[PDB]
């Protein structure tokens, strides 16, 4: 199969630097070009740059000349985009993907990384509970939940029962409050009969901070 | 350089619809066109290339038309799996511009919302606020109203909400809206209510409970 795996992505304040890497496999990664595309929160697409890793000859996009440097390491299938000085403007996901014919529309893409610049310092998220109650019954169905709130940057990973419950679960994109610090909440709606059979715990992990947190929701008297 | 305008900006269309989305070149492209999918949270797909060439994989019912400076993308019957925003871009000419993205949603048969209501937990409490969150949950469309109101008092300017993308297999939203005070302001207070005005439901719905009680 073929699989493109971005990694590097993360905060960094104006004028900061970063490294963002390509792990390349299911194919001959010599064979063909590799650009970096990225595309900032809530916005289009715009196209960074390409690589030959045959030659390491680049070609990048006009404003991105000085401060975006793309190379490869043609002994790990791995491509780099060394970005300096960078500016608030550069806030993206970057994608990594395949460039086969020698136009330049691209066939395969990565997950893409994020890269947040801003001076806001990094800081974990409070985990809350969202307590279940007959105000959030509705017949056959409860509504329980977490809110996980005041972190930096985005983003945090939210699971049930670590990963063994999944349907009805619904976790909402974070919004970004006055003070600078984003929020969200995680909800699941499960059968008004399981509640005070089953335990529910939200597992939150917010990898900027390094911090991981697990909450149990139990039902509460409102 | 060349720009890509794409139209409609967004459209709704019911399953097994055709649906036609347009991508204009300021100039002659000839036919160095391809498309994109883009679901949310996911990586853009490759759709067609050389403006009418179906990428090796994708769904037959995904089809390119056109050439110079006039585009379309076509799905013979769109499936709830479909909700994207699909871009174009021309790939000749440098800088390789893509189109800014048609943002294509399912109609579906209206569905009124669950609402369910969450008073704020006593361990946030400590921490000096309070957070009341309203959940609006799988509905249909995505227009809907949330209203707060404090002691009869309605809210403006301390409430956020958030929506969920659309779900891929039934087609319904969900919403959460959340209210933020001080502990201070939360306790000078007793009755907290969401009221939720949405087309599914006839007359506005409200959920409520009491501070002192909750």
């Known amino acids: 199969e073929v699989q493109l795996v971005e990694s590097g992505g993360g905060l960094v304040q104006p004028g900061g630097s970063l490294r963002l890497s390509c792990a390349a496999s299911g194919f001959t990664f010599t064979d063909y070009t590799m650009d970096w595309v990225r595309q900032a929160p809530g916005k289009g697409l715009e196209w960074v740059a390409d690589?030959?890793?045959?030659?390491?000859?680049?070609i990048y996009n006009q404003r991105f000349k000085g401060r975006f440097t793309l190379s490869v390491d043609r002994s790990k299938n791995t491509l780099y985009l060394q970005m300096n000085s960078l500016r608030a403007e550069d806030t993206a996901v970057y994608y990594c993907?395949?460039?086969?014919?020698?136009?330049?529309?691209?066939?395969?893409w990565g997950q893409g990384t994020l890269v947040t610049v801003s001076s806001a310092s990094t800081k974990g998220p409070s985990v809350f509970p969202l307590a279940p109650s007959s105000k959030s019954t509705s017949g056959g169905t409860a509504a329980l939940g977490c809110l996980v709130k005041d972190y930096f940057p985005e983003p945090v990973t939210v699971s049930w029962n670590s990963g063994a419950l999944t349907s009805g679960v619904h976790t909402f994109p974070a919004v970004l409050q006055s003070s600078g610090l984003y929020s969200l909440s995680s909800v699941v709606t499960v059968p008004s009969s399981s509640l005070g059979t089953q335990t529910y715990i939200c597992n939150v992990n917010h990898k900027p901070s390094n911090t991981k947190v697990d909450k149990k929701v139990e039902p509460k008297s409102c | 350089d060349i720009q890509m305008t794409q139209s409609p900006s967004s459209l709704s269309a019911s399953v097994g619809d055709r649906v036609t989305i347009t991508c204009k070149a300021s100039?002659?492209?000839?036919?160095?066109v391809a498309w994109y999918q883009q679901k949310p949270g996911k990586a853009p797909k490759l759709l067609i290339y050389s403006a009418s060439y179906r990428y090796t994989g994708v769904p037959s019912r995904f089809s390119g038309s056109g050439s110079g400076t006039d585009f379309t993308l076509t799905i013979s019957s769109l499936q709830p799996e479909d909700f994207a925003t699909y871009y174009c871009?021309?790939?000749?000419?440098?800088?390789?511009?893509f189109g800014q993205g048609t943002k294509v949603e399912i109609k579906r048969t209206v569905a009124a919302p669950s609402v369910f209501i969450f008073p704020p937990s006593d361990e946030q409490l400590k921490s000096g606020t309070a957070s009341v969150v309203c959940l609006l949950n799988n509905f249909y469309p995505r227009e809907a109203k949330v209203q707060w109101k404090v002691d009869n008092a309605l809210q403006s300017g301390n409430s956020q909400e958030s929506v969920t993308e659309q779900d891929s297999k039934d087609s319904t939203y969900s919403l959460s809206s959340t209210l933020t005070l001080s502990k201070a302001d939360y306790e000078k207070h007793k009755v907290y209510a969401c009221e939720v005005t949405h087309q599914g439901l006839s007359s506005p719905v409200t959920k409520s409970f009491n501070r002192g009680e909750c």
């Open positions: 993907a395949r460039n086969l014919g020698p136009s330049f529309y691209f066939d395969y």
């Open positions: 871009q021309q790939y000749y000419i440098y800088p390789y511009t």
């Open positions: 690589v030959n890793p045959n030659s390491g000859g680049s």
């Open positions: 100039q002659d492209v000839s036919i160095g």
